[PDB]
Symmetry: C3
Subunit: 206 residues, 3 copies
């Protein structure tokens, strides 16, 4: 398992940290997982995904989420030169601090990127080639393909239309709501089911 590796000693990280990966998660041989990473149950990590917890850490990927081809997870440093926490570079979730927090039943679709500090709430679809950076995406959200959230909080239950780059909180507060007739309303549930089954199938051949 050359592709699952400790992070190196740095001025902000004095001991190597090794990923904690649940046995029901599947890491593709050509995915890469480095450093202080926790990956939950049934998580499918596809080829060419890179989860790199060597600058900002920790990075958490919750149960039944998926990390698809070419997705990148990385984060800005959380420890100062003085050794003090950089509060603006961490996100608090359930009373704990993370560089990147991915909740449960989250899909990170092909070539998307979540860059810390960032959190993605449960049951949220992050669409293909989408981008999340210095942002909190609520639960039950849909980032359509090529959308982006930079420096904002996306309210629970909203979607970002394809191609839209949201940098203003006033715009984020105004985003349209997911409804039963919205075209992507049931997509994440489908994608999560598929990827749980892919992880199970790939593990049976391992």
């Amino acid at each position: 398992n050359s592709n699952i590796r400790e992070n190196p000693i740095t001025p902000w990280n004095p001991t190597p940290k090794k990923p904690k990966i649940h046995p029901s998660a599947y890491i593709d041989p050509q995915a890469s997982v480095i450093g202080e990473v926790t990956i939950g149950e049934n998580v499918m990590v596809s080829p060419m995904a890179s989860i790199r917890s060597d600058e900002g850490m920790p990075i958490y990927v919750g149960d039944n989420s998926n990390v698809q081809d070419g997705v990148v997870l990385h984060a800005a440093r959380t420890i100062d030169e003085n050794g003090n926490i950089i509060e603006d570079n961490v996100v608090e979730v359930d009373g704990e601090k993370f560089a990147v927090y991915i909740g449960k039943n989250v899909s990170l679709a092909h070539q998307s990127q979540v860059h810390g500090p960032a959190a993605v709430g449960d049951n949220t679809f992050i669409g293909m080639q989408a981008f999340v950076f210095k942002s909190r995406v609520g639960k039950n959200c849909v980032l359509e393909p090529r959308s982006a959230a930079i420096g904002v909080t996306i309210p629970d239950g909203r979607y970002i239309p394809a191609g839209m780059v949201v940098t203003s909180q006033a715009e984020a507060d105004k985003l349209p709501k997911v409804t039963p007739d919205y075209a992507y309303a049931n997509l994440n549930e489908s994608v999560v089911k598929v990827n749980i089954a892919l992880a199970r199938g790939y593990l049976e051949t391992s």
Copy 2:
């Protein structure tokens, strides 16, 4: 050839499928090809490309096409829980059904993505970081870098300007036409020649 692999058994796929790759195609050691995939003659598949036919299948890449660095091919499931074909998730081309169909002399340039259901017609350039999803791109087309086609049919012989995200069929019908003086008019022919020669050169060292 650890990087050329069968897909796993899943509820929608009861037997493993293995890629069919012509001997004149070159698969980079750090490209990944999984599942029910057919790759034609002289196809150059560059490092970090991921062709993954494990959800929707089959994926077809025609003769003399190229799949460049970091390109992703994947597709939505084509078989229901009941085992019935999901017709909206397949494309018909020449009387056959595909999850993703890439025609002949097609360039999929660096970091682009074609996500099924989708078809790309012959002699079409899909530019760097471009995106094709639930769409039919005609033949002799040019998707400039960062362009996207989502949920539309691109008429033969049109181009999408750089950065434009086309989601409306009315907009797709109005796209500008490739002409001899268009800046990208002869690019695909050049890129196809280069990649055929790269595949030949890389195979001679293999």
Copy 3:
């Protein structure tokens, strides 16, 4: 070091060229470096980056720069079928000719792409998922995430706002100036420090 490779013989390249990589640079095992490439001191090349100098060449990455996850460097051919240099496909920097020139203290952030012909000047941040193609980016510049420069020269000391695709020189000449109170004004210095330290740390475990 299977991932550091010569380029193949082609009609435009009659002898194989091998990368020249300084001993203080770190190449991730799942990065790929092919062909006529020069990589300077302390350069961190992250997982899934592909530096491919097999069509246009040479590709140069200067001292203390970094090439992050999923970044692609490639270039259009520089030699004609007749064997004459294609002048429009090379960039001159300090009296020398390159397919891609990356200066010193440059960050190529996750999933960005620089496609030759192109030059990036010293101390410039190329943001996540950004794109540089047939362009000269000045020194002390910031391309925010999802920005792009195609067919233009970016003056020294300017930034491109997130998501903006610059294709017109008149627009490039008008881009806003980096100032001490600009949000990204000090980012590149920070990122360069981090990546120098990452390269040192990763090499100590190698």
